Amino acid sequence: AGATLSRGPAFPGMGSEELRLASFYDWPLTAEVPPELLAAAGFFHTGHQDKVRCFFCYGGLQSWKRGDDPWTEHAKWFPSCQFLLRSKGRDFVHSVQET
Ligand SMILES: [Zn+2]
Numbered sequence: 001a002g003a004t005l006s007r008g009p010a011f012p013g014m015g016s017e018e019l020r021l022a023s024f025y026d027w028p029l030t031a032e033v034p035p036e037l038l039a040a041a042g043f044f045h046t047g048h049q050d051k052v053r054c055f056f057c058y059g060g061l062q063s064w065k066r067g068d069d070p071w072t073e074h075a076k077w078f079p080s081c082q083f084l085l086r087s088k089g090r091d092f093v094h095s096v097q098e099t
């Protein structure tokens with residue numbers, strides 16, 4: 001037995017990092033994490049505050065602060081994300097989940 005994780009991105013259009021970066025044109029001044037790191041780690045900006053979603057697993061995160069690693073938060077909250085696993089690797093995700 002065992003269902004399989006689907007391969008289709010939640011938002012295929014936001015699969016381009018370049019386009020993900022564009023969405024952070026209004027990423028707030030009181031925000032504390034750089035758009036480039038966020039966009040690199042699969043996230044694009046939604047709304048007018050500091051909410052982001054991953055283009056693939058659609059994991060939603062907000063309340064970002066100075067020192068938050070987008071790749072680490074990605075692995076903390078959405079470990080089965082296929083974009084995350086292909087980018088950072090099995091060992092990286094396992095490491096964040098254990099600790
Ligand atoms: Zn994801």
